[PDB]
Design an enzyme around this catalytic site. Structure first.
Site, PDB file in Angstrom:
ATOM      1  N   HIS A 166      30.122 112.904  -9.082  1.00 44.86           N
ATOM      2  CA  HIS A 166      31.318 112.703  -9.576  1.00 44.86           C
ATOM      3  C   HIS A 166      31.080 111.625 -10.621  1.00 44.86           C
ATOM      4  CE1 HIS A 166      33.251 114.856  -6.277  1.00 44.86           C
ATOM      5  NE2 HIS A 166      32.263 114.535  -5.754  1.00 44.86           N
ATOM      6  N   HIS A 188      33.537 122.584 -11.201  1.00 36.31           N
ATOM      7  CA  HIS A 188      33.889 121.038 -11.090  1.00 36.31           C
ATOM      8  C   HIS A 188      32.893 120.019 -10.752  1.00 36.31           C
ATOM      9  CE1 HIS A 188      33.785 121.199  -6.402  1.00 36.31           C
ATOM     10  NE2 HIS A 188      34.009 122.527  -6.598  1.00 36.31           N
ATOM     11  N   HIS A 221      26.743 112.368  -4.121  1.00 33.45           N
ATOM     12  CA  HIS A 221      26.995 112.843  -2.654  1.00 33.45           C
ATOM     13  C   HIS A 221      25.691 113.836  -2.256  1.00 33.45           C
ATOM     14  CE1 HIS A 221      31.431 112.052  -3.238  1.00 33.45           C
ATOM     15  NE2 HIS A 221      30.901 111.045  -3.177  1.00 33.45           N
ATOM     16  N   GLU A 242      34.232 107.836  -6.891  1.00 34.73           N
ATOM     17  CA  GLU A 242      35.410 108.217  -5.899  1.00 34.73           C
ATOM     18  C   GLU A 242      35.570 107.000  -4.967  1.00 34.73           C
ATOM     19  OE1 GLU A 242      34.306 112.177  -4.694  1.00 34.73           O
ATOM     20  OE2 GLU A 242      36.056 112.627  -6.052  1.00 34.73           O
ATOM     21  N   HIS A 271      25.492 116.677  -5.370  1.00 35.60           N
ATOM     22  CA  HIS A 271      26.445 116.590  -6.652  1.00 35.60           C
ATOM     23  C   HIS A 271      26.823 115.087  -6.862  1.00 35.60           C
ATOM     24  CE1 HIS A 271      29.219 116.777  -3.417  1.00 35.60           C
ATOM     25  NE2 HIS A 271      30.119 116.155  -4.219  1.00 35.60           N
ATOM     26  N   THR A 328      36.107 115.245  -0.604  1.00 34.40           N
ATOM     27  CA  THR A 328      37.063 114.595  -1.857  1.00 34.40           C
ATOM     28  C   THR A 328      37.498 115.896  -2.657  1.00 34.40           C
ATOM     29  OG1 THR A 328      35.009 114.155  -3.254  1.00 34.40           O
ATOM     30  CG2 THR A 328      35.871 112.350  -1.775  1.00 34.40           C
TER      31      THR A 328
HETATM   32  C1  LIG Z   1      31.142 118.976  -0.065  1.00 33.72           C
HETATM   33  N1  LIG Z   1      31.851 118.310  -1.187  1.00 33.72           N
HETATM   34  C2  LIG Z   1      32.704 119.003  -1.844  1.00 33.72           C
HETATM   35  C3  LIG Z   1      32.002 119.764  -3.249  1.00 33.72           C
HETATM   36  C4  LIG Z   1      31.346 120.758  -3.167  1.00 33.72           C
HETATM   37  C5  LIG Z   1      30.660 121.348  -4.454  1.00 33.72           C
HETATM   38  C6  LIG Z   1      30.671 120.213  -5.285  1.00 33.72           C
HETATM   39  C7  LIG Z   1      31.489 119.119  -5.526  1.00 33.72           C
HETATM   40  C8  LIG Z   1      32.100 118.647  -4.345  1.00 33.72           C
HETATM   41  C9  LIG Z   1      32.211 116.974  -0.948  1.00 33.72           C
HETATM   42  S1  LIG Z   1      32.880 115.783  -2.362  1.00 33.72           S
HETATM   43  S2  LIG Z   1      30.889 115.863  -0.298  1.00 33.72           S
HETATM   44 ZN   LIG Z   2      31.486 114.803  -3.714  1.00 37.39          ZN
END
Ligand SMILES: CN(Cc1ccccc1)C(=S)S
Ligand SMILES: [Zn+2]
Length: 257
Positions: free
Chosen positions: A93, A61, A116, A103, A91, A195
């Site tokens: 989004h 994802h 993030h 997001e 990571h 999220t």
């Molecule tokens: C920690 N995460 C969940 C996540 C874990 C791995 C990849 C994408 C999201 C948040 S969205 S901050």
């Molecule tokens: Zn994230």
């Protein structure tokens, strides 16, 4: 299994993860005019000089750049936070188009992507215990807009060919996340959640006001990734964002006037 498609996307998540309709879900829209300046908020302290990246993983994802979090090497402190939070991974989004992908939104504006940087509170000993706590995580959210390239992102972009499909990983050492930060550390902060499933309500969100610019070529390379595993039907990893959730009984605070 959950995902971002028509039949397993964010509107479905609540069936397996009922906390999806909880009291402190993320992301949210940041209404800049109603956020309240909190003069008592401390400056953020981002100490990434000793960060040690280890590898990069396509988890189906997103892609995660993972760090050695077995010592206080890359930590976030100050701001709204009590104590010390250790960097475990970052990571992004992103969207299928430059007009969507983030997001969080800012006065309903969507950015092309959102970074993030995920940190866990050292008082809980590891990430798995931290996510079970209301102050377990601190996530530094940074918006990406399309324009000039971000040179500090390029090493990430260039390794994505090696992790095209779900479950692929690559060595990724000596990557310096300081090259992904904007000039200003002015931020908004509120209590929220992961999220993605399991959507746990364990996150102090710290969302930077200033976006970073990345080039069209850089974000295009994000969009060549795949949600699927190798030898499965190809589905481009795009639009891996959850839309804004109700603010409910929360006030967003600003570190700046
Ligand atoms: C920690 N995460 C969940 C996540 C874990 C791995 C990849 C994408 C999201 C948040 S969205 S901050
Ligand atoms: Zn994230």
């Amino acid at each position: 299994h959950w995902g971002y498609g028509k039949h397993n996307g964010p509107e479905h998540w609540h069936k397996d993860f009922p906390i999806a309709k909880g009291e402190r879900q993320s992301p949210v829209d940041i209404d800049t005019h109603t956020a309240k300046y909190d003069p008592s908020l401390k400056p953020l302290s981002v100490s990434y000089d000793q960060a040690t990246s280890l590898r990069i993983l396509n988890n189906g994802h997103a892609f995660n750049v993972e760090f050695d979090d077995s010592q206080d090497k890359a930590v976030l402190k100050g701001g709204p936070l009590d104590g010390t939070y250790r960097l475990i991974q970052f990571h992004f989004h992103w969207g299928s188009l430059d007009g969507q992908g983030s997001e969080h939104t800012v006065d309903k504006k969507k950015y092309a992507a959102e970074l993030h940087l995920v940190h866990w509170n050292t008082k809980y000993g590891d990430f798995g215990k931290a996510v079970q706590q209301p102050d377990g995580l601190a996530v530094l959210g940074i918006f990406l807009k399309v324009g000039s390239a971000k040179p500090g992102l390029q090493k990430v972009v260039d390794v994505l060919d090696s992790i095209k499909t779900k479950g692929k990983s690559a060595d990724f050492t000596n990557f310096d996340p300081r090259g992904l930060l904007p000039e200003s550390l002015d931020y908004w902060t509120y209590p929220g959640s992961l999220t993605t499933p399991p959507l746990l309500e364990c996150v102090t969100w710290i969302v930077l006001k200033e976006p970073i610019s990345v080039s069209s070529e850089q974000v295009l390379k994000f969009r060549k990734l795949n949600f699927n595993g190798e030898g499965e039907p190809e589905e481009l990893m795009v639009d891996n964002w959850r839309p804004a959730q109700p603010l409910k009984n929360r006030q967003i605070k600003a570190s700046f006037k």
